Amino acid sequence: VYQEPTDPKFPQQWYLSGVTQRDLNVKAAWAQGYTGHGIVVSILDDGIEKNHPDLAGNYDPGASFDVNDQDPDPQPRYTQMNDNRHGTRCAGEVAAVANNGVCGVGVAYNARIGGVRMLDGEVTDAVEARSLGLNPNHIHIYSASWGPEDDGKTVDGPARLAEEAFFRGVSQGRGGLGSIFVWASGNGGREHDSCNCDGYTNSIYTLSISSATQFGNVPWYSEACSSTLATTYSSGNQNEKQIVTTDLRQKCTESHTGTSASAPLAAGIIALTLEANKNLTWRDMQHLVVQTSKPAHLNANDWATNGVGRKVSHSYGYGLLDAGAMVALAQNWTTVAPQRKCIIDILTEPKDIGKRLEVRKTVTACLGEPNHITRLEHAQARLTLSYNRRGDLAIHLVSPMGTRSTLLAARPHDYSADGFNDWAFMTTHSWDEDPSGEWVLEIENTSEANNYGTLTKFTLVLYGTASGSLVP
């Protein structure tokens, strides 16, 4: 009979286990015998306190490096401000030791945990690449919340070395099964940011996670976008509890916060899942998340049912992660077929945007070809356009099954005149839909200003397979 952890702060870890059912259902996974044994997770951040009394027992130097100083030791740089505590906080979320009379427990409290010190210095493309590409046949799961500053006016993603690291990771990482890159969707809610403008979370190669408050609401810091897959609990207002974890200087904290605290919890759940089936590919893991995640009691004004009957939100993706359901579905999971990629160049001539532009196109999704797709995974609308004030644009994409994805919401602080240069807006909301038929792209000026510009390229890129569907 499974006995839950006795750690002093475990009762404060409301998101792990509750009578309330406002939790991630992690205890059910533990009771099935999955606690993360044999799985390796790395926190890509500001370092890890490897001698922390609640981390030392699970610490793995093979999951660690210091890319800022170019040496193996990921110890945080100690300062009066305690600036470099974040990675240590995230590590504890994943893999804090259980039943040791110290603090709380990790989601995967028998997993091995390391950290990369890479944010404490100048973060170049090369630094990002070397962090993403750290020991990819030892580390199973990476967790990160970096990328562009979420100031609501930036459009930025991985440069060439980092993008190459992503493709190398998912292709040859983890014995060919693919590195699992878990990402926080962003924290620019206050600046009205729209997270598809962040190429790291907008990537198909990252498994992107947003936040819900304890009372099941969309936190002030949250960013909505179509690229997000799912949600874990994090902080909210001052009546709502927060994340309880390991802190710098061998301390315990009850006030870890933000979307950056949601990603590590997801990484821990994904570790439990990988323990339940070590053969899951990077794409398998995303399927599991889509199928098992739970909308219930998450409050949003944009819940919509897609073409295969699943509820999806731009704030929450497919909903709250469910660890028990993940590990259950993982055990007899059949590996998905090889990924197909159908490239459809939509325009025959450039199109004036004006006040509103609608582009309709009926596609066959590579019928008759080896990239024929009847089961969609990710879809991208890769857009090249000029515009005089970028943040006034809102962009939507409607699938043949009638699923309306917001690719871009108005960003009031984005006054850029640089437009978009083949930016690959991505949506997860049409997952498992048949993409044959009429797609609709909508671009609109949300302001009353006389704005102007031209859409010069629209590539619809479809990823997925042609086999093995479930009944909706």
The residues annotated as belonging to the active site are 45, 86, 260
Three-state secondary-structure class, residue 384 = strand
> Would you tell me the crossing angle of helices 323-331 and 282-292 to the nearest 10 degrees?
130
Q: Nearer to Na ion by C-beta: 151 or 156? A: 156
| Residue 7 assigned to a binding site | yes
| Residue 184 assigned to a binding site | yes
Q: Is 54 in the site for Ca ion (CB under 5 A)?
A: yes
Q: Nearer to Ca ion by C-beta: 29 or 330? A: 29
| Residue 136 assigned to a binding site | no
As measured in angstroms, the least distance from the Cβ of 53 to Ca ion is 8
As measured in angstroms, the least distance from the Cβ of 80 to Ca ion is 27
Residues after which a C–N gap over 2.5 Å breaks the chain: none
The two three-digit tokens of residue 218, written as one number: 């969309």
Contact 267, 182 (CB under 8 A): yes
Q: What angle do CA 31, 36, 37 make, to 5 degrees?
A: 105
| Residue 185 assigned to a binding site | yes
243: which residues sit within 8 A by CB, 6+ positions away?
15, 89, 93, 233, 234, 235, 254, 255, 256, 257, 261, 265
| Residue 102 assigned to a binding site | yes
As measured in angstroms, the least distance from the Cβ of 407 to Ca ion is 43
| Residue 237 assigned to a binding site | no
Q: Nearer to Na ion by C-beta: 73 or 418? A: 73
Numbers of helices and strands, H then E, in the chain: 7, 20
As measured in angstroms, the least distance from the Cβ of 57 to Ca ion is 9
Q: Is 66 in the site for Na ion (CB under 5 A)?
A: yes
Q: Is 208 in the site for Na ion (CB under 5 A)?
A: yes
Q: Nearer to Ca ion by C-beta: 162 or 243? A: 243
- Choosing among Ca ion, Na ion, none, which partner's interface includes residue 309 (Cβ < 5 to 8 Å by kind)? none
Give me the residue label for tokens 């339940």.
Answer: 276
138 phi, psi to nearest 5 deg: -120, -50
Burial of 401 (0-12, 13-18, 19+ CB in 10 A): middle
382 phi, psi to nearest 5 deg: -90, 110
Q: Is 83 in the site for Na ion (CB under 5 A)?
A: no
As measured in angstroms, the least distance from the Cβ of 342 to Na ion is 14
Q: Is 432 in the site for Na ion (CB under 5 A)?
A: no
The two three-digit tokens of residue 87, written as one number: 């990675």
As measured in angstroms, the least distance from the Cβ of 347 to Na ion is 21
Q: Nearer to Na ion by C-beta: 102 or 229? A: 229
| Residue 156 assigned to a binding site | yes
Give me the residue label for tokens 């398998």.
Answer: 284
Contact 412, 429 (CB under 8 A): no
Q: Is 436 in the site for Na ion (CB under 5 A)?
A: yes
As measured in angstroms, the least distance from the Cβ of 46 to Ca ion is 22
Q: Which residue is nearest to Ca ion (CB)?
A: 7
The two three-digit tokens of residue 47, written as one number: 């370092």
- CA gap 142, 206 in Å, rounded: 10
- For residue 413, give the DSSP letter: T
| Residue 436 assigned to a binding site | no
For Na ion, which stretch binds (CB under 5 A), given 49-57, 209-217, 386-394, 397-405? 397-405
List beta partners, residue 317. Answer: 313
- Choosing among Ca ion, Na ion, none, which partner's interface includes residue 302 (Cβ < 5 to 8 Å by kind)? none
Q: Which of 2, 6, 38, 73 binds Na ion (CB under 5 A)?
A: 73
Q: Is 103 in the site for Ca ion (CB under 5 A)?
A: yes
- Choosing among Na ion, Ca ion, none, which partner's interface includes residue 102 (Cβ < 5 to 8 Å by kind)? Ca ion
167: nearest Cα among 117, 132, 131, 128 = 132
Q: Is 163 in the site for Na ion (CB under 5 A)?
A: no
Q: Which of 16, 26, 39, 102 binds Ca ion (CB under 5 A)?
A: 102
Determine if residue 412 is left, alpha or beta; phi over 0 gives left, psi from -120 to 50 gives alpha, anything else beta.
alpha
Contact 285, 133 (CB under 8 A): no
Touching Na ion, residues 137-156 (CB under 5 A): 145-147, 156
286: which residues sit within 8 A by CB, 6+ positions away?
207, 229, 377
Contact 243, 256 (CB under 8 A): yes
User: Total residues at the site for Na ion (CB under 5 A)?
Assistant: 17
Q: Is 176 in the site for Na ion (CB under 5 A)?
A: yes
Q: What angle do CA 52, 62, 145 make, to 5 degrees?
A: 70
- Choosing among Na ion, Ca ion, none, which partner's interface includes residue 7 (Cβ < 5 to 8 Å by kind)? Ca ion
- CA gap 283, 262 in Å, rounded: 20
Q: Is 69 in the site for Na ion (CB under 5 A)?
A: yes
| Residue 187 assigned to a binding site | yes
| Residue 200 assigned to a binding site | yes
- CA gap 91, 106 in Å, rounded: 8
As measured in angstroms, the least distance from the Cβ of 49 to Ca ion is 14
Binding site for Ca ion (CB under 5 A): 7, 54, 96-97, 100, 102-103
Binding residues: 7, 46, 54, 66, 71, 73, 83-84, 97, 100, 102, 104, 128, 145-150, 156, 184-187, 193, 198, 200, 223, 260
Binding residues for substrate: 46, 83-84, 128, 145-150, 156, 184-187, 198, 200, 260
Binding site for Na ion (CB under 5 A): 66, 69, 71, 73, 145-147, 156, 159, 171, 176, 203, 206, 208, 400, 436-437
